[PDB]
Amino acid sequence: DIEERINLIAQKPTEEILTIDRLKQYLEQGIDLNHYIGFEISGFVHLGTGIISMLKVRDFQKAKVKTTLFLADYHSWINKKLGGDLETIRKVAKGYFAEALKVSLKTVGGDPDEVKVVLGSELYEKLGIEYLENIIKISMNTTLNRIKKGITIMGRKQGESISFAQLLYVPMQVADIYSLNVNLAHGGIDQRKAHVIAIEVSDAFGYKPIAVHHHLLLGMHIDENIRQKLFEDSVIDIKMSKSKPETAIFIHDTPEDIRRKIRKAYCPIGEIELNPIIELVEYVIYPILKEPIVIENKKTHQTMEFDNVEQLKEAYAKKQIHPLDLKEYVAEKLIEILEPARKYFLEGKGNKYLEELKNLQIT
Amino acid sequence: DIEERINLIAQKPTEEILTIDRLKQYLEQGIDLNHYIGFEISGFVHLGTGIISMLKVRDFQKAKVKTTLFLADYHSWINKKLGGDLETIRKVAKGYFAEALKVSLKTVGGDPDEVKVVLGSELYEKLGIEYLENIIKISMNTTLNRIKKGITIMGRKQGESISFAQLLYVPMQVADIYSLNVNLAHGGIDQRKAHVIAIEVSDAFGYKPIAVHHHLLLGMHIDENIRQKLFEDSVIDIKMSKSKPETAIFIHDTPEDIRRKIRKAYCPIGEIELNPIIELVEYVIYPILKEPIVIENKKTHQTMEFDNVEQLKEAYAKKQIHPLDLKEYVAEKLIEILEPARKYFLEGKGNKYLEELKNLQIT
């Protein structure tokens, strides 16, 4: 069973695990894996922040680990998110953002009742001094350059204007992992540097936490020629974010919005290296539902069935699949998947949080 | 009476007050002045750390302000003081260091029962979240360069090896002032930068704290030619410290030790600009007891009476006072002043803390 668990933790949404041997030792000795993932409360919940993260949380639940959803309200308050008002960030956390992550977990096929939602302020108040001690013990075993290099954890460049709270962010995040006795730290690949610092200070806590980083799902508009020829990739990268609404596919977007956003997305004829459409197939659609991928051509009336995403990338490199039919298949699949979440947020209980907590606070 | 209070807060041990107008506005409106002074628990208590600081605490008590002695155990634990063990630093604080500052306050002529001794850990545990919030609010309104320049608060150079906890020291000290609602921040002139940062973040706390900095009492051995020709003064300065025992006059030193340390001290013939002996007269002896300064020459059998330290510096510039007679007068005066403290620490209750808490912990 052990290998099935590792495969289950190191599945397709996973991009990198540090380290697979440490995870093997942690299962050989019967050790119990605690997991959380940090979420800055910023903007609506889209596919990259919600679906793929919950795809991993569910994959962790099947692997019989403990899962936890962490709402870092202080980390968002440092980055001046949602107007910089702490009370505003706290409601979206306790209200809109938590219910958004739980319905996304149920949508991808997880149990929202089995995971634990922990707010940052309540955790720091519960521990009290132990949190500040962990911060100092981390800061005593790390350098300023390492913290000044781990700015990409929050999605900010090294050249952008700074504040000492943004530097304090990094030991605070490392303190979050140690405070919750988390053995399996999880997040995006942009959250790698802070997790590496956590392993570097395991001497002051008694255990090395294993870091798992999923694939940062890539936005629809990479039509801008940010050609990457080689810090360089970390700064100039662009992904599905919240300042850019038209390139973002939120879990509560109208089917018309999903169609018009998928349609205007970047999709070359045979290119696969940076296609935002096949990435939705590889990291969102197929991981949610593993049934064979069927696209329906127009010019030829035959359907086109592939057992797995590798055969799709084969056929797309051979220019056998027209981009409009792949786009129309992705849009329809995303509509059928998100429709439960859309009903909650637009037609059911979720409307109170989405309509007011997020929009009303916006000036 | 107002001017008598300002004179009483801005007396000879005071080197600089920021700002005298702000202190005048704070007394014109009847505002109440809260005071603390931070103490890293490091080494024995000598004249610079104990006597002159308590001379100001007593001067503050006469000015009818509230006084508080703060034992920054986390700040010493960051600087790896006393072996870096938190529990060891906590006992000297609760035991040796607190009783040392209180008997020094009673020696200079203050009330040890009127001041409040506050430990850092107990304060941070009492406030809990409010302390961490204040730290973030300070760090959000300050830059990294300002914190990277305020390293001299703990007595460390910019070029020396660093740790992120030493940088976090500075917003923590600013958070100490705001957490205790301190309107009159007090310390050495080396503690000026952190107090300036506190005024710079008064926007996030609702009041500008007034900073008072006393004269850093200067060590016996400045015979080394650290000639200062112009950061430069802050790095290369040398003062009465605890790594250098022979240049330090502790409050519990044997009269033989005080004599042999005063005797080998630096004392030019007519120079006054850097004489460690006249500084003991100007900032220690005369402020404690304001009776006319009487030195007794040997070659001429006449005594030499001066109303105040300015006339001493006049006569010393005229080479009318031989350095051995000034040294023998300073040594005898320091012996008669510290003898109450010596009895407590060497012959009375203080021996248990001094003999064991400090020496036993040393390996």
Pick among B136, B138, B141, B161 to test the A interface (most A CBs inside 10 A)? B136
Whether the bond between A67 and the residue before it is cis, its omega within 30 degrees of 0, is no
Ramachandran category for residue A84: left, alpha or beta (phi over 0 → left; psi -120 to 50 → alpha): left
Tell me which residue in A74, A128, A147 faces B164 most closely, judged by beta carbons.
A147
Ramachandran category for residue A80: left, alpha or beta (phi over 0 → left; psi -120 to 50 → alpha): left
- How many angstroms separate the CA atoms of A182 and B149, rounded? 36
Three-state SS for A53-107 is: HHHHHHHHHHCCCECEEEEEHHHHHHCCHHHHCHHHHHHHHHHHHHHHHHHHHHH
Q: Do A140 and B165 touch (CB under 8 A)?
A: yes
Tokens 């064979």 appear where? A292
Q: Do B144 and A164 touch (CB under 8 A)?
A: yes
Chain A residues whose beta carbon lies within 8 Å of the beta carbon of residue B203: none
Chain A residues whose beta carbon lies within 8 Å of the beta carbon of residue B163: 139-143
Quick one: tokens of B137? Answer: 């609010």
Name the DSSP letter for residue A274: T
Determination method here?
X-ray
CA distance B182 to chain A (A): 22
CA distance B166 to chain A (A): 8
Domain borders along chain A are 1-217, 218-363
Tell me which residue in A128, A129, A139 faces B165 most closely, judged by beta carbons.
A139
CA atoms A17, A208, A24, A27: torsion sign:
negative
Q: Do A136 and B78 touch (CB under 8 A)?
A: yes
Tell me which residue in B121, B128, B139 faces A165 most closely, judged by beta carbons.
B139
Please give the resolution of this entry in Å, rounded to 1 decimal.
2.8
Instruction: Identify the bridge partners of residue B116 per DSSP, sorted by sequence position.
Output: B68
